[PDB]
């Protein structure tokens, strides 16, 4: 077979070695490890192809085409499409996917916002700097 | 109908559409029935010189074409540029034939406009110089049939069949960029050609003329223009 | 909340199947990050995912993309989180095209493996939480 | 990645990057990591005189950049043209801003290449001497955030809040038509140009730089070119 | 206008929307923005 | 049937993007989503 | 049944729900029941 698929950290990624790195070898992660198992249980045989144009997939909607790795698909390029390539609406038209091998969720990444500790001179915060002249002014003047 | 301006040099006499019984230099507003004409003398397979311009300090549409020792055909017709072509054109050759073959070999080309940005103060420009016609020339949007390459040579016919070049062929060179002319900054743009032809004798009376056009922006072979019209027109009015 | 401030640039990952939920949604928040993320179109729409991890760790950028992606994220930059729950749930379909034998010989294979846990010990490893600090646990706080 | 050399008039220091410590002149050579650079005075809004040629029998790249009555900004670097930018290319402007506010306005931009039919054969032109950039300019593929007209300017910023030039934004002014170079017919094209501009002081410690960049046929705004990449350029190697 | 054939076709058809709640939706996209954190945000108070 | 309507935010606005918009599409706040509802119930054009 | 022509009639249709998010103002419908009122509803703790 002819499998399109595209970089994406964790799950499709070049392997870390010296040597000229031939056919299927240049590829780790997790999308291959799980290309490794489906290939020893329905017993064919891979090879890792890239995407051309580097996208996902979708419409350009202009022409009504597609790009990535759904146009890879339709146009029968490539046979299968072992990629973080998710499950929409307007995909499922067009190609044939399977069930789920992980569940998604589209959320918002963000920094964590810097938790600046109490510092050790802490209970001095309670009063206002002028405050506590105000009280060693005070028993340095009622005491007097 | 796109508006479009031409200097046909008509290789063919059509009395069915206006032009004499001569072969004739001529000029176009939007109409292939041509304004004025001139007595071109037609040598065989030969070289060239042509040049147009429009000079609105004398508002006069001056076209001239020489064949090294053979005379001048000026055929200048006063029209006024303002209202009878767009603000935007796109400017190029076109060249057809029709049941009589001829070469249409463009062999060098140049263009040089000058308008008014405020007419001391450094004029607008579009010089280019094509002496060397590429195989991949991808400034040029030659419609039609044209080909192009192989030499030094714009052929503006499908050619090839031993220079006999395949009757009833039509292929247009037109230029990649716009040019700014209606009035607006008045009209003085000063647009020059320098149009080396060279037509081939196919021993079969050479004949459906070449053009030099200033056109819409958007254009293309008109309707079939594989005769009388030239190349460019749509229809003989 | 993220949709009623201006401060903060918000986009999503260009040809995605993010920024296509968006596009159609017709909840009122949701195309109300779309009326906004359609005005700086080119500003805030990101080429790759890890543009969009990137223009996080610089500007003040919030990105929106998929939970298990994030998962691989925060569990190696610790200070970046998951902002917010799940907007909504897809999944990832090994995509075969349109009227395909491959559909249901992969359709049974994901399922082999995941009543085995070949599908959560291949996850466990391809995302190696590495030690990170989780949370300050919110809760009661004593001093020391 | 689109091919492409620029020489960025950078106004934001970047040690990071390989910017030297002063707002100067840089040359660039498919990286945002300069070849040359020079001091430059760099005075508010005044005018702009700054020059580019690279003649293949010197093979250098040099450019200056004059104020009235100041100094020039000589950065030529000896690079070769011949193996490090595309057969044809499409030349044009680049401007930028980021989490600062500069202005980016052109006043006049030329351009005059010749390019070595037989070197003696008469060789190609492609000039312009665009000193009255109109409202509908439509031999201008103006990319990004770029505008153009309301006075005789070439805005290339998101503007006119009293012009306060709007940070973040990218603007580019690629010229329609391409040139041929690569080498193949060889590259003595002394490609010139002019590149008048105003960076406007907004009292805001002005810095993020124009261009001139000579790119690929095909370009857009790489992926996020708002800052430090200064308007072309994807990467920051 | 001072007598017209659409005055009651928008009255029965206001009546729908605010019946269906999108007089309220609408209400809710454009007048809610930011929320304008209240006087009841201490979050520190060093005594002065 | 020619709507007259007078530029107050957040009622009726111009819509802000990079390319400018022609037409009915450059309006947009709380009576320009008002109008679109009526047109929808009713039927008709409408012309800002 | 093994092999049907309302699968895919269904499975595109699935697609279209959750898109909407009807498949998720129905689980809300649902499940969402009495608030179960948490374990911080101290109100009172007289010490023992
Ligand atoms: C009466 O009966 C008629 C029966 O003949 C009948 O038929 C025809 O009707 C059509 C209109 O439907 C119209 O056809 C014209 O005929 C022109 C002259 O005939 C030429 O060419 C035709 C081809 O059409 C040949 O069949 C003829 O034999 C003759 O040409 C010969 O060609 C060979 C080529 O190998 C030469 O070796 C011969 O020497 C040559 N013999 C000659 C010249 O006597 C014809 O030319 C017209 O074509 C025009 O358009 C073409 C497209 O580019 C080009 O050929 C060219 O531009 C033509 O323009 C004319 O060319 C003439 C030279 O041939 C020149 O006079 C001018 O340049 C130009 N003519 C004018 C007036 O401007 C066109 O096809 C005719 O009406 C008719 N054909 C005839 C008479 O041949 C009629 O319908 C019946 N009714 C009526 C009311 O007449
Ligand atoms: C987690 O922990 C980190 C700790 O690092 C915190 O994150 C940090 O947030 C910082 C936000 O300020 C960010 O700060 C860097 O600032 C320095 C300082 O130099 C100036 O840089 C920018 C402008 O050049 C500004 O953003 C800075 O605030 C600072 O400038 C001041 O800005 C004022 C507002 O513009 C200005 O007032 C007017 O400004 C104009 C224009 O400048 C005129 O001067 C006018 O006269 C003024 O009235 C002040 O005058 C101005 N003051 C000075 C002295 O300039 C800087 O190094 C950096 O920005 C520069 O560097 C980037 C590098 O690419 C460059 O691209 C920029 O263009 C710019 O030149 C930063 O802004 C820290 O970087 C950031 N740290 C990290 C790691 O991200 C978080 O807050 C913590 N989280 C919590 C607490 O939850
Ligand atoms: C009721 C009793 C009254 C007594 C009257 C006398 C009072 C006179 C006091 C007058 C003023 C003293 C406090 C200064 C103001 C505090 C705020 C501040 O900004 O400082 C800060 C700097 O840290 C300091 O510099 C604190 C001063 C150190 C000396 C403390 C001596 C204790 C008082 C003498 C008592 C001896 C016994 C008294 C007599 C037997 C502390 O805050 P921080 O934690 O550093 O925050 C930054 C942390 N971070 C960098 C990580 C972010
Ligand atoms: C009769 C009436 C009186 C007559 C008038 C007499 C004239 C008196 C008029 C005085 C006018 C007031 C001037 C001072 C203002 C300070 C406030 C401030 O903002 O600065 C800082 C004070 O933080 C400190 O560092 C305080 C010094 C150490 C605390 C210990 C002092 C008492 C010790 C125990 C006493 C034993 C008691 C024994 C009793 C028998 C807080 O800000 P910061 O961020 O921390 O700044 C760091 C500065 N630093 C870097 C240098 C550290
Ligand atoms: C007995 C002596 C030594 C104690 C210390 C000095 C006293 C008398 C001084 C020092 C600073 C003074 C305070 C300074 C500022 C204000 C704010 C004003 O709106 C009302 C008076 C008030 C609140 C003052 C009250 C008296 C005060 C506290
Ligand atoms: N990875 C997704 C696009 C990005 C996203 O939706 O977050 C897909 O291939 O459909
Ligand atoms: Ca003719
Ligand atoms: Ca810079
Ligand atoms: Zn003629
Ligand atoms: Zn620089």
């Known amino acids: 077979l002819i499998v399109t698929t595209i970089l994406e950290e964790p799950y ?11 056919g299927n070898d240049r590829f780790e992660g997790y999308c291959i490890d799980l290309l490794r198992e489906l290939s020893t249980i329905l017993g064919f045989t891979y090879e890792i192809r890239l995407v051309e144009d580097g996208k996902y997939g979708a419409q350009d909607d202009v022409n009504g085409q597609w790009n990535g790795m759904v146009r890879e698909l339709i146009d029968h390029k490539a046979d299968l499409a072992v990629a973080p390539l998710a499950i929409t609406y307007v995909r499922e ?34 009063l206002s700097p002028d405050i506590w002249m105000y009280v060693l002014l005070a028993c340095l003047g009622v005491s007097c | 109908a796109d508006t479009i301006v031409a200097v046909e040099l ?25 304004k004025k004409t001139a007595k071109w003398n037609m040598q065989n397979g030969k070289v060239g010189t042509a040049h147009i ?8 549409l001056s076209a001239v074409v020489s064949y090294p020792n053979a005379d001048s055909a000026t055929v200048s017709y006063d029209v006024d540029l303002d209202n009878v072509l767009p603000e935007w054109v796109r400017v190029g050759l076109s060249a057809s034939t029709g049941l009589y073959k001829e070469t249409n070999t463009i062999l060098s080309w140049s263009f040089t406009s000058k308008l008014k940005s405020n007419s001391t103060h450094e004029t607008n420009a579009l010089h280019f110089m094509f002496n060397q016609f ?37 292929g247009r060179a037109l230029f990649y960029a716009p040019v700014h002319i209606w009035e607006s900054s008045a009209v003085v743009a000063s647009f020059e050609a320098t149009f080396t032809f060279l037509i081939k004798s196919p021993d079969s009376h050479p004949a459906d003329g070449i053009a030099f056009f200033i056109s819409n922006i958007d254009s293309s072979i008109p309707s079939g223009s594989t005769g009388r019209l030239l190349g460019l027109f749509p229809d003989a009015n | 909340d993220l949709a009623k401030q201006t401060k903060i640039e918000y986009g999503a990952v260009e040809d995605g199947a993010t920024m296509t939920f968006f596009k159609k949604s017709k909840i009122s928040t949701y195309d109300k990050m779309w009326a906004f993320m359609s005005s700086r179109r080119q500003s805030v729409l990101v080429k790759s995912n890890e543009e969009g991890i990137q223009r996080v760790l610089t500007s003040d950028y919030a990105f929106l993309m998929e939970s298990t992606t994030i998962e691989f994220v925060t569990q190696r930059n610790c200070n970046l989180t998951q902002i917010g729950g799940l907007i909504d749930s897809k999944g990832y379909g090994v995509g075969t095209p349109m009227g395909s034998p491959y559909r249901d010989k992969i359709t049974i294979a994901i399922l082999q493996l995941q009543e085995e846990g070949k599908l959560h010990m291949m996850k466990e490893k391809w995302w190696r939480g590495n030690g990170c600090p989780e949370e300050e646990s919110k809760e009661a706080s004593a001093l020391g």
């Open chain 1, 12 to 22: 499709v990624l070049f392997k870390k070695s010296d040597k000229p790195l031939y």
């Open chain 2, 10 to 34: 008509d290789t063919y006499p059509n009395t069915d559409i206006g032009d004499p019984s001569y072969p004739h230099i001529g000029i176009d507003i939007k109409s292939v029935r041509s």
């Open chain 2, 134 to 170: 590429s195989k991949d020339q991808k400034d040029l949007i030659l419609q039609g049939d044209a080909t192009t390459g192989t030499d030094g040579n714009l052929e503006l016919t499908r050619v090839s069949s031993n220079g006999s070049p395949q009757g009833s062929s039509v």
């Open chain 2, 53 to 60: 311009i429009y000079n609105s300090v004398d508002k006069r």
């Open chain 1, 93 to 126: 038209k067009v190609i044939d996917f399977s069930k789920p091998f992980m569940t998604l969720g589209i959320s918002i990444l963000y920094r964590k916002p810097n938790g600046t500790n109490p510092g050790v001179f802490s209970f001095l915060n309670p």
